[model samples]
Target: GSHMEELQNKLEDVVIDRNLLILGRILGEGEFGSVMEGNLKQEDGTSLKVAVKTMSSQREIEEFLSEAACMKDFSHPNVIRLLGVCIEMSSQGIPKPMVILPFMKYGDLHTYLLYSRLETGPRHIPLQTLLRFMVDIALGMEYLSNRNFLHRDLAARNCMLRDDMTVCVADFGPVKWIAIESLADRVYTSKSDVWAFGVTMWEIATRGMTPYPGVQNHEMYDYLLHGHRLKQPEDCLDELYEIMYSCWRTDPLDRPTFSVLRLQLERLLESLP
Candidate 1:
C-alpha cells in the first residue's frame, strides 16, 4: 500500500493510458530491464517509432517509473523525450511497467564509436565529427543544468546518437533532482555530473576505450582524489584535452559549467581546420 501510494504521489501527473502502445521487437537488454522497439498508437491514426523499456523486478520498476516522472515534462532537443508510459498485466499476472522513448536509430554513442574504430570499412569518423559529438553532449548537459536536473551518470553509453548525427542525453536511472548542498550530502549536483562528463569525453576521444583501464571501480574515488585521471588520447588535441581536464577538477566549483563548456566547444569547432 505504501509503495503504490508513494508511486502515485510522484507519478500521478505523468502516467499515460496503456492502450495506446504497441510493443514490438527487443532492441537491447540490461540487468534491470530490456528495451524494445515499439510504436505509439495515437488517436490521430499515426504510429510513431518508440523504444520501450520494460523492468524485470519491483525495484527496477520503481526506478523506471520514477525516471518517467522526471522526464515527463522535460523538453530539449538534445535530451530524450518521454513519449508515454504503460502499466499492464503480463502473462505471469505481474504488473509490468514500460517507459516509451523516441527510438534512436544508431543506438548509443559508445557502441557507435567502437564500431567506427574497430571496423575495417572505408567509413571512418573524422576528428571534427567526434568534436561535434562532444559539443552536442555539452549542449545537452547545459539544458539539463539550466533546468536544475542532475544527470549523475553522464557517460558515453548513456548518450544516444540519432540519424542526423546529433546526440541526445538518455537513461535516467542514475539521475537525481538537484537541491542545495547536494554534493556534501552525497546527493548529486551539476558538478558531479561534470565529473562524469569528463569520463564520457575520454571515451569519445579514445574511440570507446574503457575508463581508467586497469583501475577497479572501488578504487576510482581514491585514485581521483590522489590527482590521477585518464591520460589524453594520442590523437586528441591539447586544447580539447584541456577542456576534458577542466571537468575533472578536484573542487567542483573550479570546474566549468555546461554552458561555459558549450561555448568553448563552439569556439573550438569554429576554429578547427
Candidate 2:
C-alpha cells in the first residue's frame, strides 16, 4: 500500500516551487506553448539561469510531465537535464505546466546553423566542426541506446549547444525522423533510431536543411517505399555519405548500432585533420 503511495508521489518529487522562479522573455514559441528564460532562486542564497518551457494544454499535461520524468534519471553530459517543473494558473483560467532546464546560451543547433547565413549572427562553421558535431551526437546516442532509452524524437532542431559549443540532445519526439518501416504500424527500436540519426546527419551536412527537400510529409512513406532515398548534400564526402547511407537500409537489422556509428565518425574525423 505504501509502495503505491510512494509511486503516486513521484511527480511531486520532480515538481518545483513556482515561487522560486522569475519568468522572463520568450526565447521560442509554438502553438501549444513557449520556452522562456528564467532565474531560478535556490536555497544556498544563489540563483541560476534556466529555460522555462510552458505548455497550456491540460490535454498534454500528462505527456508533458512524463517527458520531465524521463529526463530525471538521464545522466549523460550530451543529454539535457531537467532541473524541475512548475505548475500555475492565470488569466487563461487553466493550469499551465513549466519545465525547467539549464539555459542554453548558443540555443538550438538548427537555429544556429540557419543563423550562420546571417551577417550579424554566428560565423560560418567549418567542416571539421561539423564532423565533430556529428560525432558528439553519435556519442550521446550511444549512451542513450546503451541504456535502452527510446527517443520519442531525434533531430538537429532538438539539439542545443552549451556554452562550450558542445551539443546535447533536448526536447521531444518527431515524424520526418521515422524509419520507412516505422512509418507503418511497426514498433520503433534501435534500428529505427539509426534511420533518424542518418537523417539528422543529413541535416548537419546541409547545415540545417530539412530532409527530402521536395517531398511532402504526406508523401514521405511512399517516396521511401519506391526506393528513393535522400540524395547526398552538396560537398558531403563520398565516404561520409556511404556511412550515413547505411543508416537507411530497408532492413532494420541492416543498420549499424550507435556504438559502431560513433566509432565510424570518430575514425572519419581522424582522416580529416
Candidate 3:
C-alpha cells in the first residue's frame, strides 16, 4: 500500500518537460499503470498521437526498462516503439512514473476481436487483409527469433493494430530466450509461442474465435496429448490452413522459424491466383 500510494503521488506530480500533453478520459488502466491518450510534439514540431503507459510502482520500473532495452536492441517496423520514459522523481509531490508510446487506435488484437463483433462474419476479413496482417506479424516475430528472443507471451492480447490494420506485436515484458549455442536439447522451447501464433492466425481467420473453446489449460493438455487440434473449418483456404498447422507443431524443432514462415506466407500470397 505504501508503494502504491507513493506511486500515485509520483504520477500526480509528473513534470511535462517533453511537451507531452495529458488528455481527459484514461485510455487504459491495469496493474502496471494507466495508458493515457495524448499528443507529443516531435523535433520537427509535428505532433504525433500516442498512448502513455504510466507506472505506479518501482517494481514496474524495471519491467519497463527491460522492455525498452529489448526493443532498442532489436529493430523491426512491426514491433512497438518505445518513444520515451518518464523517470522523474518528485521529492515535492506524488511519485508518478510513466512511459510514452504510439497510440494503437484499434487497440490490442484480443480487444479488437471483441469490438469488431466478429461472430457475425463467416469470412474474418478479405483474404488479402489476412495475408498482409500475417506477413507483418511474421516480420516482427522473425526479427525477435533471429535475435534469439522469444516472446514468452505471444497471445493475441499482446499484439496490436495500426490505423491501416497492420498488426504489430506489443508488450515485450514477458520475453525470454537462450542463445542458439546454449540451447539444451530438452529445454522448454517457445514452440509454445509458435503454437500460440498458430492459434492467433486461426483467430484472425475466424474473426477472433478462441482455440479449444471452453477448454482450460489442463483439459486442453489432456485433449492435445490425445491428438486433438483445431478442426479444419469449412471454406478454409489451403495455404493459410497449412501455415497454421505448421505453426502448431508440438515439437519446437519441427515448427518453422519466422524466416521460413514468412517465406511460406509470401509464397502463399503470390500463389493465390
| Best-performing candidate as measured by TM-score | 2
lDDT of 3 at 168: 88
Cα deviation of 167, candidate 1, in Å: 0.4
TM-score for all models, in order of appearance:
0.85, 0.90, 0.76
Stretches off by above 4 angstroms in model 2 are 1-13, 56-67, 90-93
Of the two candidates 2 and 3, the one with more favorable TM-score, higher being better, is 2
What's the candidate order when arranged by decreasing lDDT? Answer: 2, 1, 3
- Stretches of candidate 3 above 4 Å error? 1-24, 56-63, 88-96, 113-124, 174-190
For model 3, name the residue pairs that clash: 9-94, 9-95, 10-94, 10-95, 10-96, 11-95, 11-96
In model 1, how large is the Cα lDDT of residue 56? 64
Q: For residues 1-273, could you state the per-residue lDDT of candidate 1 as single tens digits?
A: 997786676587667677777779987897978989887887689988888888667787777678777778788878888786888778986887777888888889988888886656325788888889999999888998998987766789889988898998988642221112343366667887887887788888898888877877656555665678789999799999999899877777898999998888889888989
Q: Rate the local accuracy (lDDT) of all candidates.
A: 0.80, 0.86, 0.68
lDDT of 3 by residue, 20-71 (tens): 5554469778796787887877668788887887774656666555555445
How many clashes in each structure?
0, 1, 7
Clashing pairs in 2: 153-173
Residue 85 deviation, candidate 3, in Å?
Answer: 1.4
Instruction: Give per-residue lDDT, candidate 3, residue 101.
Output: 76
On lDDT, the leading prediction is 2
